[PDB]
Design a protein around this nucleic acid. Structure first.
Lengths: 44, 92, 60
RNA sequence: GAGUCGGCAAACAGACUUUGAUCCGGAGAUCUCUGAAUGGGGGAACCCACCUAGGAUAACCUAGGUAUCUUGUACUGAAUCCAUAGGUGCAAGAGGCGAACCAGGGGAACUGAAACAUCUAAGUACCCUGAGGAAAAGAAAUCAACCGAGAUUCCCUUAGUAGUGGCGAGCGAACGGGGAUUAGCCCUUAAGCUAUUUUAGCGGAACGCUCUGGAAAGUGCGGCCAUAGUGGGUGAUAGCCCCGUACGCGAAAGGAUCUUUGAAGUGAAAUCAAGUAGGACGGAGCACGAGAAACUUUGUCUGAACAUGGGGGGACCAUCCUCCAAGGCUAAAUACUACUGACUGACCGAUAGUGAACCAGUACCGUGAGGGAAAGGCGAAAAGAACCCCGGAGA
RNA sequence: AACCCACUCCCGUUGAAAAGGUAGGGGAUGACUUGUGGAUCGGAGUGAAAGGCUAAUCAAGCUCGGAGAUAGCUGGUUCUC
RNA sequence: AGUUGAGAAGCUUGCUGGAGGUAUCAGAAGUGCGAAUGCUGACAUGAGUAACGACAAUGGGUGUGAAAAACACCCACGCCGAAAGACCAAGGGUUCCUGCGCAACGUUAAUCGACGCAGGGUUAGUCGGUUCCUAAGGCGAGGCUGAAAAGCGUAGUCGAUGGGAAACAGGUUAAUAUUCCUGUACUUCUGGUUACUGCGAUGGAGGGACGGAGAAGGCUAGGCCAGCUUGGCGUUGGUUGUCCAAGUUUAAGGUGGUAGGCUGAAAUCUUAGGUAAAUCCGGGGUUUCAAGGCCGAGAGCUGAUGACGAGUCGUAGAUGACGAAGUGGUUGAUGCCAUGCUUCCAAGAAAAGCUUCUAAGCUUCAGGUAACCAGGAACCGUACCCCAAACCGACA
């Protein structure tokens, strides 16, 4: 039956994208923390 | 510009679908620069081969992806233009 | 070389020189795409020769 | 200074020899699109543009410009007569990021008390805002007793002492000694001043025969070096085979540090103090939980003397002592390490040491924040097995 | 009848399936079903109300810090004489 | 393997191994494991046991090959056919096609593959995007509010699942076509030219612009029948037949203004309204006339003398050329007219392009009006799957 994940690219970018994280103040701290660990991606 | 004409063409492409195309019609396949418009390769054919061409179509190719140990390999991607000449003046 | 090019020629004369070896760069990209280029040393040489004449123009 | 075309790794093609080719250091030129991202928007690495001066053929290209806020500075001018708001043009600055350190704003709970409400934990964790290479603090309305000491900051004692505390758990000074370091001055505002090292290099001493061995640095047998003898690595154990090790020279050119030096700030460089001191309820900080509670603070309400005054000496009062509050400026001793460079180890030796010696914050697991592995070794040298036979022309 | 839902029996329970299947059932022009896009969040939302749902987790999620929380309670504690 | 001590343990040697080891006596300890439903790799018993994923069936032949129940072709059986067929949207990300392979994968074998290595392969003025305008909602200069972070919101500018120009038919391919090719079309823009001429806003008006249910109709796609061409003469009993099989196709656009619907029209003066103005709309007065006018499927004619066509003829296996009939009668939709019509209460989106009005400006060049040749239409996505072995469920 209906599993709990139905994919879409327009909903993914507006919630978890870069311009969404960079807009707020918590999200810019999510960027610096995830960058300074050294991850390859930063924008899932 | 004085330049920018000697940049937008990177040679022919000849293969099974391009060999039969240039014989039955007059259409020649060039592996053009990575970002060029339909005007500025209409001019770079009239300047570098001295022939008149009626119209030009283009398309983009995605690079094929290899999967091996210790990496994924994305090959380079590239544009491609079919140059449809006049019925005379097949080019070189 | 570079000491040759600083002999004055001009802004225009060396400015004519660039449109010469862009032809020689064009013909070496056409022959490589086809089957006939053995002198692979020539192909990596005019890249280092266009760079010289652009240097002696953006400075004097 | 004779070889070279980066690493995981072959065959092509070629550049210079004795010097500028690789190769190392200084300075410059280019520097696509994203990102504070800043011409307007966006789903980060995309779309649509204007303006100006030039060039270009019914289709464009060069070259710059074009964000908001502060300050200033012109021009401009609403209801409104004047003239402020407001609007444009220009100049200068800021914005973002970074491990810890410092000062402020806000500030828990578990847990202790063998339960638990005061109290501890604790003004600790965390969250914001500033600034600096350190910051803050500092030049007596301070402490001592009738003797005297003269800024602050930091370590060692006084001392787990006087105190404080459901007088429970607990929390805990000062005075005085010993040290480190050794300056004091005054008006942002009556009337202000606020010469050496460093990034590249170069020279650098002394050994021969003889055995065994695949191969001598080892067995033998002698000699030499020394301001450099416990280094590395060379076919096995090398002061004397190779690279290095003790001293000097530096350096076109930059950098920094002390100087002269330039401006300006670094700033040597004048007074002084009104809604101020005190007071009354309500809170904080003082080791100090309304306690005989001094003193500093400030949310509400009030209010002085003119340095013939004033305020301090732990309720309070008289006598003595000692200092000038309501304006400012300051080096040194001090705290820290994301980043370097030398060195050193009664530190580890691939289930240890970083999560990570291996292409590791990777693979993978998650809508996300986030979590997060396993993985070293042929030989001195590829000399990495020509050729033959069975096999699918393979394994 | 499509379509949405889940009343009964049997099979399945190491399933084909971390909730299905084959037979039968109820609504089926409306207090309907549904596609795309948005809004509401942790002593806080939503709820024709069952303490139900909020990413297979819910009488108060998930993750990282305080934090090696506290355990008069269980389990274990390595060579000789 | 031997041997020595009360014990922890010590000592000497045979083989493998191929470069490090530590008397003695003192120090420093990450100092001694069988057990913690201990932790991480290896290997057992269960056990060559259960299972091998719907109870839509396969049986021969010929081929290739080292080897065919499963691969290819052939002949014959079965099964879905409101899907087990075609196509768009998501989503995926080269799985599509061809050479070369078969160790691993695929619940077995494989010469086969959505599997390895190497090449190839997506063509747009009109189809979807971008560009224009907006709904819910987001962000938000200035501005208020707040210990700090920040919160709310005006101008404004983003946000489709909606609203805004235009194309269809046939050929071609190992693999792409409404994109290339032939054929006939349509829309918008720029530069000249010519004949002239009141141009102008983001501001007014008009329009765009819409609910449920129901019923009259009118067409059309499609489907059958009957003719008509090309071929056939048999199942053994019958069948030159009033028989048998197959084929009888054709678009967008032009012209046309019908079924049917809505609607008074025209002149002329005037005006407390359209936040300014208006020659536009609104309101008022007179007069003349029966109504205009605006929408609108579809038929017919044309596109089309053309294409396509069973076939036939010229390794004729692949191709080159030729090519007959191409018509009438009926029955038709849940498909278009219909964004209509009537009825009922629960009273049924916005904004722009489009048409017109004028303000400032006006220099009436500019700007507009037709007519005309001349040219242009940028950039992204186009392969394959899509009730599925390619997407969501750890899996074919």
């Amino acid at each position: 039956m209906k599993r709990t994940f139905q994919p879409s690219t327009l909903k993914r970018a507006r919630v978890h994208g870069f311009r969404a994280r960079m807009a707020t103040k918590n999200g810019r701290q999510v960027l610096s923390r995830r960058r300074a660990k050294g991850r390859k991606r930063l924008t899932v | 510009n004085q330049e920018r004409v000697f940049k937008v063409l990177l040679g022919p492409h000849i293969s099974e679908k391009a060999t039969g195309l240039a014989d039955g019609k007059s259409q020649f396949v060039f592996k053009v620069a990575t970002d060029a418009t339909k005007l500025e390769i209409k001019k770079a054919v009239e300047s570098l081969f001295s022939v008149k061409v009626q119209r030009v179509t283009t398309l983009n190719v995605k690079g094929k992806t290899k999967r091996t140990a210790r990496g994924l390999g994305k090959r380079n991607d590239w544009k491609k233009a079919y140059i449809a000449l006049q019925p005379g003046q097949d080019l070189d | 070389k570079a000491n040759e090019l600083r002999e004055e020629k001009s802004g225009p004369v060396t400015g004519n020189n660039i449109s010469h070896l862009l032809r020689d760069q064009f013909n070496l990209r056409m022959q490589k795409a086809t089957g006939q280029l053995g002198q692979s040393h020539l192909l990596s040489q005019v890249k280092r020769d266009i760079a010289r004449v652009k240097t002696v123009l953006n400075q004097q």
